[PDB]
Amino acid sequence: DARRATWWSVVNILVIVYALIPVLWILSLSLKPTSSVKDGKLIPTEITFANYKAIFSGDAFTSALFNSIGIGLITTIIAVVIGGMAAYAVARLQFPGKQLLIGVALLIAMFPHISLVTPIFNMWRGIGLFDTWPGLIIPYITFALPLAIYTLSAFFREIPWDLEKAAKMDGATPAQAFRKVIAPLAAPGIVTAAILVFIFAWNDLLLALSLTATQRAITAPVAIANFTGSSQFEEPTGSIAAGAMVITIPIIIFVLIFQRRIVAGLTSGAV
Amino acid sequence: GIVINYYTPANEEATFKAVANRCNEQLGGRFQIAQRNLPKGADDQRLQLARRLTGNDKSLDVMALDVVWTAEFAEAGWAVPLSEDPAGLAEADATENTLPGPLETARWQDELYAAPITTNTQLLWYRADLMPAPPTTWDGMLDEANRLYREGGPSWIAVQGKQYEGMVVWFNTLLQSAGGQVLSDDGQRVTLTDTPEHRAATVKALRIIKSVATAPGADPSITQTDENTARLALEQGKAALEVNWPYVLPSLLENAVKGGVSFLPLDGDPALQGSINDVGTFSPTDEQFDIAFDASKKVFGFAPYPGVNPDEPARVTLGGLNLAVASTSQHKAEAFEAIRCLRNVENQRYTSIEGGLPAVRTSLYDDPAFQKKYPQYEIIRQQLTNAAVRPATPVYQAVSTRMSATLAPISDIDPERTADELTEAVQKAIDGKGLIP
Amino acid sequence: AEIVLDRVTKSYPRAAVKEFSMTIADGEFIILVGPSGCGKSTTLNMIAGLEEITSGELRIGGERVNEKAPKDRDIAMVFQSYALYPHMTVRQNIAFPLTLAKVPKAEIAAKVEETAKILDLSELLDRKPGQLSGGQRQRVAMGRAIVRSPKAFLMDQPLSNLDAKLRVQMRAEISRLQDRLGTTTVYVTHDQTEAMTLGDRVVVMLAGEVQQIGTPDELYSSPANLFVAGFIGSPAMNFFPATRTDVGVRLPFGEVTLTPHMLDLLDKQARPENIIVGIRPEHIEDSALLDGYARIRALTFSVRADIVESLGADKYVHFTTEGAGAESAQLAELAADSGAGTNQFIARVSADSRVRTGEQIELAIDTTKLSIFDAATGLNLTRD
Amino acid sequence: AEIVLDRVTKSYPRAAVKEFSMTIADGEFIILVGPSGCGKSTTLNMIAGLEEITSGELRIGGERVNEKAPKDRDIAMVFQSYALYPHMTVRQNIAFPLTLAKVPKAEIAAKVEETAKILDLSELLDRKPGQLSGGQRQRVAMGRAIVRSPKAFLMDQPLSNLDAKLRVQMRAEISRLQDRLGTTTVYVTHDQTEAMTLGDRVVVMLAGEVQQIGTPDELYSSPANLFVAGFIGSPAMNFFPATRTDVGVRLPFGEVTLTPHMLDLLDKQARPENIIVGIRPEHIEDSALLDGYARIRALTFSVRADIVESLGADKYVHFTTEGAGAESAQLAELAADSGAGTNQFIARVSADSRVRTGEQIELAIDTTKLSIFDAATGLNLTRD
Amino acid sequence: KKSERRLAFWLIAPAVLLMLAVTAYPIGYAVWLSLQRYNLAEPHDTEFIGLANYVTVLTDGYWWTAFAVTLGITVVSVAIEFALGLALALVMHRTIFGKGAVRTAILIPYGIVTVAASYSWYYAWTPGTGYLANLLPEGSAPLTDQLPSLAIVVLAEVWKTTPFMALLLLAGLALVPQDLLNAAQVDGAGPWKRLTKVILPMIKPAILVALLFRTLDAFRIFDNIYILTGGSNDTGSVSILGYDNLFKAFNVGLGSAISVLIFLSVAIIAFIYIKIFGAAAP
Ligand SMILES: Nc1ncnc2c1ncn2[C@@H]1O[C@H](COP(=O)(O)OP(=O)(O)OP(=O)(O)O)[C@@H](O)[C@H]1O
């Protein structure tokens, strides 16, 4: 029906506009020269790379990005392994009280950071150990594991373990058959859970901020939250906007690629 | 090879990078000097520093702190006192040739805990292209801005109005100027309303704040105008006036040479071609400074800080930076050689001449080349004869946040009940009770 | 290769294969019919090595095998689920068992292509599973069995998910390749009519005990018990629990004057007081039709036919009658899955018959098709 | 309701509901039939207002139903998947349309009790579904319809979601229900046996238009075309091409002479070129039996038997030949999905037959329905 | 029985070595630490005190203002984020076009770094600068007044958190068979009762976990107030009060009492869902 198809065509662009303009705004506010800073036009003029050149001029961002990625990978891997090791027992084993073990994790996933920050800073994790990566990786892992348990449990409810029964008639030895049959089906699940943990662990500001304060471990959200101008007497907003555009630039292209996996993992395969 | 982490607030980074480079070139192979930025804001500057000592960081060596806090660090046993050089030299170098006021900020109880490096008071900046003699009284200043508002001109006052320790500077200048003070001389008790003369002082100071906060044609965001906004408001041509610090000078000249401010087209003159540095700083030649300033002085300029009464020149509040050596650094004899050469008598020539901060080595204000290149020098010296300190006691910061938080909006205050409100909050902060917001 | 098993057992918190035995010669497609919740899948799992023999023994001709590992034993199962490895191509899914058995890649390329020519996959084989039709998918699961030139074949109701027109089609293809292989083989089912379409000897269970076994024509013509008799054949037998009267059974619409051809074969033992008599709907005639001496003597009665319908070339015709329908021995045991409204009896006429719903129809019956069982036991008096 | 529908014209960017017209009436039970994809569900959706009437009109009572809203456009519907709201009680699932229609609580209570007695649900209407499983839920779904006493009814195809055995009770109770109601109903299927059972008329369609419609016994006995004759009476005829023959027919195993009455039809019009002969699996017999005054016209033959069906209520065999019989006007659509083969055939034989596999099966034919068809259009010549 | 139980307990054991000594132990230490006259600048002397930290937080007005503000922002943000997220889910579920364009766009505000999403609003709502702020009247002062400031805090958090909630509702909703709706539709419900009477009573468990997960995460907010207003004008939410009382003043005893009192308040919110609404795991 051409009128209702037009109405849907309108609804589709409206929701795209709602999601994109507060992003394109940052790009435009960054690209606007300091003459067009304080000029109210959203449509830019005389756009310049000078602010982006000023981000990479001096080593201030290199360590923030490189530490964000390093912490992302290590907290992903340790969460994926122990979260998968839990998820196999949560799916395949049928032990008494198993609902408690899944129930408590989805609660501590939501726990209030401004509680945890006081005791940890006043412990051997801030007085003994302090700013080096373990002082973040240990709390990061804790908020990551529940998301690993949920998403990996959803993938292990999806795999038919009766494929193992078929495999145990395709010869017998599981140390060959299970190894060769099951891993190709496990892979798209585990890589999706790894992506979602990497992103979910990326942006917990209160712990990233409160436990670091060095050129090592001052991760990408903290770097921009301490940043307040590239220069002495330039209007700082264009430089801040450039920094925000730099920091976001990886994770947009990252989620842009893996969309089916991302929505399936959160939706437990429902879409 | 060892490197020394020199912490600085972010407002004077390019200056301390130039100073750091000089020192790093002068020192030879001993060790490197490297700068680090704390935030721009006058208590976040403390937050990110105390967090590096409450946790035992080894990446903290030399730190620039605000003249207001030092009693707290000293009483906490951080910021180890200047007696402890193997060279013995820092306690002499700190005493050697300073302005006397800043040096008296740097000792908690007889012993020095830091060495002064910069000091600053405030100047009343004004647009000579649209106004006559710089309004002396706050009342006359509001009168002149009212004229400009009715004429349709740059009506804003651009005061340091925000809920932070950098605003308590302003109020405490008004209270000191009106003849009151926050704490007793001994620091042991409140004194905001100790005598009915103090009641009159504080209530007048609050009326004056309320007046500037609410007069018709005021700047819309004046509850949230941080210090950095004031500089920008004048340079944007939106304010005919401000009461900023002594460093708005070069920032304007720089923002007139590198394209920028429409009322001063110095960017149009061949004399300034290549005058700005390839690191992005200004740093003109002597003739380029002189022509930039001689073009500016007809449009833009300064005066001593306005009075509460018609004829009582203000007890303007003392500000600055004191360098200290941290407790936690593993080596530290090397950090004392760093502080000595960071406050070197040549080194701080650049700190004023191009960095905008007033130097503390006394002779620089007598020297002719400095007195030429630093044209505001005589007003600063003058004010440092009568400039009021903030009350040195370790509770200061806990008081100053309580006082500011009681004046949460800068408008919207009943002066009389707010005077009691200030006394109550300040009392509780000396008592150390309750929660800071 | 033949197989045998004896004295068998299973257990669950339920003796699912309690005291079973069988022999499974070359070429025998043994069909294991019965109600769901017998030891069906579980006995095929025992034979496949996926289940535990709690007592008794199994033999693949070459050895006893209940003692043996899941290595060897009943090779070449196919799955009721049509289970496959969906990341692989269909050609790879056919090839996989031979590649796991280290078969050379030229030997794969031959036996994969021959199997894909036997099956309906010769064009489709380059695709992944699930991107393909369910009969082809099932066919790949049969390919998985076919490729391993196996000792046996195990079917697991492989017509499960198909529509009926495709079930009977694939039943022919299974018959061809069962005969072409000559394997000893097995196929469990709950479908009685489908079990008549192929296979050398039906076997039937009440739960874990064999009720009967034999070739399905012998099974249909000479059933041992009312349970196995009533389960067999498409038209369910009209059963009358009844008084075992001296003339033969006196059903009140048209009494059975039983001739000596069974009545003297009854009188060779002490006669029962009560019986259940069964007759096949296919054995009734319209009494207004047929020809010769049968039209007089065929046990005739009239009842108001409560429905009729043609089914194409015939008419199924329905009516109600008296009988002791509240009691059971091997009858309520069927009523578990189906069987109610005991008074509703059914008959079969040709489409040439002028009969219709809602009229008094004369029906004719004879003693050649009659069957009788103990009202106390459900065991047949007519045959073992 | 008056049930008059015409000129579908719903064709997609694909003929879909393209030429259809219905002419249905009060009290009728109609079956809609064909292969998958014909627009059977889409025409039911247009009747239900789930699509709006593109061309012509849909009417019932005095109403332009074609132009009406989806709400109450068809006053009852039932869905194959037994559509049932899982959070509710079973009683609430039944009451749902009546509480949507805001009927008073005493009327709800009386009518839900009535409905839950019209179906055997009186012990279940208190319990939630899933606790009330699919074997009861199948009844609950059609319970929704009954609370309206609906002016017209769409059945969809309920029985095929259920397992094959229970359909004996389900189809009996569905027919009883229609008997108890005395109102119009329509049904859809992909199977001819499901249509012939309990139907008043059958409509067969393809590509959004009717191929033929009528009473099912005429539709069976008198098909419009050979592809329709392959659909109704699912044991389809053996079909063979011919050029022409001056007395009757030629076959791979014999000849037919019949009588002049059918040859008159062939010479009744200009259709003597390529033609089809189509003979049922019915009208075939074992040549050892049915001899007599008819035996001279029984036209006996024999073919080697490869496979047999032998359940004893009746019997039948496959038979085979060689020849280029792969021709199709539209018959490939019937060949595509069951029993596929160019020279593959079947015959019925009575239970008295004793023939087996691996031998020459001697057989005879009954003249009284032998039939002939246009090779160009597929049309039946003997009766439309 | 015991064989797979033994295997399972040994496979679970790492995920209770972690998520105990790095959750329950920190909290348990935070309890003891709340019982102390302990200031972080003088660790050489400390004293046990019975209740004075808890009584202080329970009676000082700066706790109650910040606390009441988090409840307000919680209920206001969650209600809007739900009602929008529901509509957003339905659009991306039922749109007729190639939906991958919409699925692309709806992930972006989910994925994006929370601080960068926040500077966007900070400049959009500052006068003479934001394309949005520039179309308020002169003298409007958009960001400095308390209630307007709270409105801008809410806007950033609904724009940032509603896409995740639209996925939890979508996953709660895409399970629903279309024929249940076709039935409600031919029975004459229309769209309003298709939503209210038909589908919502199915999706109850999924909407309850979605509301809970948005509620606790909306309670413990920080960055979108810190980057955007710094707790000024008394706008500071409950987490930011627990920041300043440890790193702007050093009384770790009181900052530990805030740390516990937050956590018990979150626990009581979770209890209302888990008991009074059931809300069990999906
Ligand atoms: N591993 C097991 N543990 C416990 N009980 C079992 C197990 N395997 C089977 N059973 C029992 O056997 C029954 C399942 O039937 P079985 O697997 O023997 O064949 P079936 O599935 O009934 O046959 P069909 O596949 O034809 O339906 C269940 O009711 C269950 O009680």
Ligand SMILES: Nc1ncnc2c1ncn2[C@@H]1O[C@H](COP(=O)(O)OP(=O)(O)OP(=O)(O)O)[C@@H](O)[C@H]1O
């Ligand atoms: N809303 C629609 N848009 C486009 N095409 C449709 C729509 N509804 C139905 N169709 C067409 O109708 C067909 C599906 O319904 P139809 O009754 O024609 O066949 P079917 O339902 O698959 O058959 P069966 O009911 O036997 O499975 C599809 O092939 C499709 O092209």
Ligand SMILES: OC[C@H]1O[C@H](O[C@H]2O[C@H](CO)[C@@H](O)[C@H](O)[C@H]2O)[C@H](O)[C@@H](O)[C@@H]1O
């Ligand atoms: O000169 C640059 C410095 O200006 C500010 O410091 C002044 O105002 C303070 C409070 O904000 C006073 O306490 C201080 O004594 C003054 O120097 C600013 O706070 C600093 O960060 C700048 O470095």
